[PDB]
Amino acid sequence: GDTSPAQLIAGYEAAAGAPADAERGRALFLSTQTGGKPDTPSCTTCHGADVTRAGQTRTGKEIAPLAPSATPDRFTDSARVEKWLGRNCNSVIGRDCTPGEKADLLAWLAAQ
Numbered sequence: 001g002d003t004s005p006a007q008l009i010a011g012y013e014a015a016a017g018a019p020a021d022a023e024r025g026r027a028l029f030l031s032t033q034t035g036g037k038p039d040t041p042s043c044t045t046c047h048g049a050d051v052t053r054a055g056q057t058r059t060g061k062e063i064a065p066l067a068p069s070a071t072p073d074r075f076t077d078s079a080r081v082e083k084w085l086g087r088n089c090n091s092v093i094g095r096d097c098t099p100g101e102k103a104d105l106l107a108w109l110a111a112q
């Protein structure tokens with residue numbers, strides 16, 4: 001692609017002023033939010049609670065697994081991560097994810 005997961009994470013960490021924490025990333029990904037769209041209370045509403053398995057969109061189409069262990073080129077395109085997190089941070093949480101959240105979320109997702 002044009003980047004590696006580590007390089008995406010390092011730049012978010014620099015923008016956040018702090019190392020990623022995958023424990024916090026796992027906890028934000030599984031949480032239930034009430035500030036965004038009603039039909040998308042969690043990251044897991046489409047991607048599931050196990051990211052090594054396929055997810056599903058809101059009309060039941062299949063979404064390839066987020067885990068790099070199941071879909072290999074995950075997180076190797078900086079523009080793509082920013083395009084999808086920009087869209088779905090807003091749907092689920094109601095605002096853009098901050099650089100610390102992005103760092104924490106990718107650090108957890110990159111190890112599955």
Ligand code: HEM
Pocket residue numbers: 029040042043044045046047057058063064066073074075076077080081084085088089091092093105
């Ligand atoms: C804020 C909670 C979420 C997180 C952290 C998250 C994370 C991600 C990431 C990191 C990607 C890009 C993967 C890459 O680099 O290739 C992605 C793609 C995508 N997400 Fe999410 N997502 C979330 C919520 C959602 C929700 C609620 C939906 C359904 C409405 C959704 C649907 C998609 C789709 C359709 C793609 C692109 C398909 C693909 O990459 O195979 N996401 N998600």
